[PDB]
Amino acid sequence: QVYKGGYARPIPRPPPFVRPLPGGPIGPYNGCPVSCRGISFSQARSCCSRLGRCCHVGKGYSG
């Protein structure tokens, strides 16, 4: 059929892009205690960049 750029509304100009709203999973603080205890070295490193938690894990000589 022919192209109709005005169904009912004359010159129906569409709106521009709009800022969406991400929800995310519920209960994000369920695997990263502030004490940084009970987690692997790589696990603690991951939470530091994920929520700024456990960023100074490990200090001084060990073993």
From Swiss-Prot:
Changes after translation: The N-terminus forms pyrrolidone carboxylic acid.
Record bears the keyword Signal: yes
Compartmental location: Cytoplasmic granule
Disulfide bond annotation, renumbered to this chain: C32-C47, C36-C54, C48-C55
GO biological process: defense response to bacterium; defense response to fungus; defense response to Gram-positive bacterium; killing of cells of another organism
Residues carrying Serine amide: S62
Keyword tRNA-binding: no
Residue numbers of Pyrrolidone carboxylic acid PTMs: Q1
Alphabetically ordered keywords of this record: Amidation, Antibiotic, Antimicrobial, Chitin-binding, Disulfide bond, Fungicide, Pyrrolidone carboxylic acid, Signal
Predominant location category: cytoplasm
Example of a GO cellular component annotation carried by this entry: cytoplasm
Single GO term (MF): chitin binding
Tissue: Higher expression in hemocytes and to a lesser extent in heart, testis, gills, intestine, lymphoid organ and hepatopancreas. Traces in eyes and subcuticular epithelium. Not present in the brain.
Function: Antibacterial activity against M.luteus and E.coli bacteria. Antifungal activity against N.crassa and F.oxysporum. Presents chitin-binding activity.
Family, as annotated: Belongs to the penaeidin family.
Protein name: Penaeidin-3a
First and last residues shown, out of full length: 20 to 82 of 82
